[PDB]
Paper text:
RecQ helicases, a family of DNA unwinding enzymes that are conserved from bacteria to mammals, play a key role in protecting the genome against deleterious changes (for recent reviews). Mutations in BLM and WRN are associated with the rare genetic diseases Bloom and Werner syndromes, respectively. BLM acts preferentially on recombination and repair intermediates containing HJs to promote efficient branch migration. Novel structural motifs found in the domain, such as the acidic β-wing, the BLM-insertion, and the C-term extended loop, may contribute cooperatively to the specialized functions of BLM in relation to HJ.
The structures of human BLM RQC complexed with a phosphate ion and an arsenate ion were determined at resolutions of 2.7 and 2.9 Å, respectively. The asymmetric unit of each crystal contains two RQC monomers (Mol-A and -B), which are bridged to each other by the ion (P1 or As1) shared at the interface. Since the BLM RQC domain binds to DNA in solution, we predicted that the phosphate ion P1 in the crystal structure might mimic one of the phosphate groups in the DNA substrate. As schematically represented in Figure 2c, P1 is bound by Mol-A and -B through nearly identical interactions, even though the two molecules are crystallographically independent of each other. The side chains of Ser1121 in both Mol-A and -B form hydrogen bonds with P1, while Arg1139 only in Mol-A forms a salt bridge with the ion; in Mol-B, Arg1139 is less close to P1 (5.3 Å), and instead a main-chain nitrogen of Lys1122 ligates the ion. The somewhat distorted binding symmetry between Mol-A and -B is due to the limited space within the interface, which only allows binding of a single phosphate ion. Interestingly, the position of P1 strikingly overlaps with one of the backbone phosphates of the 3′-strand DNA (yellow).
Residue numbers in the entry: 1074 to 1194
The structure:
């Protein structure tokens, strides 16, 4: 139904912005600890105030129900636009963090439009 392309473009650009220290010579990489769980991304997107980061795509999702914002991310993973590997902290917990998938660069080149079906409940 609703076209969610410009949002995916920026969600993608965002995710990758918080992956390296672009600029400084040593293009240092972030994560696994400096990576976002799908919820942290949903919280950031949905302008939540528990958002770890409150810039970039911080206010974007203000027109999405929390339910739908989640499904939009569940989908972006499903579509390999965003992917998630696992992290294991010292307390021996397995945490799933999000990263870009082989299809993200596509959406960035407009070569791929994304569509989303808004759901209730």
């Amino acid at each position: 139904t609703r076209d969610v392309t410009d949002d995916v473009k920026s969600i993608v650009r965002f995710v990758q912005e918080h992956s390296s220290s672009q600029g400084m010579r040593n293009i240092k990489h972030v994560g696994p600890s400096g990576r976002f769980t799908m919820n942290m991304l949903v919280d950031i997107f949905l302008g939540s105030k528990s958002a770890k980061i409150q810039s970039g795509i911080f206010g974007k999702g203000s027109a999405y129900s929390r339910h739908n914002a989640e499904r939009l991310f569940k989908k972006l993973i499903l579509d390999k636009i965003l992917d998630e590997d696992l992290y294991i902290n010292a307390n021996d917990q397995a945490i799933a963090y999000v990263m870009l998938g082989n299809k993200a660069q596509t959406v960035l080149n407009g070569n791929l439009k994304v569509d989303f079906m808004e759901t209730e409940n």
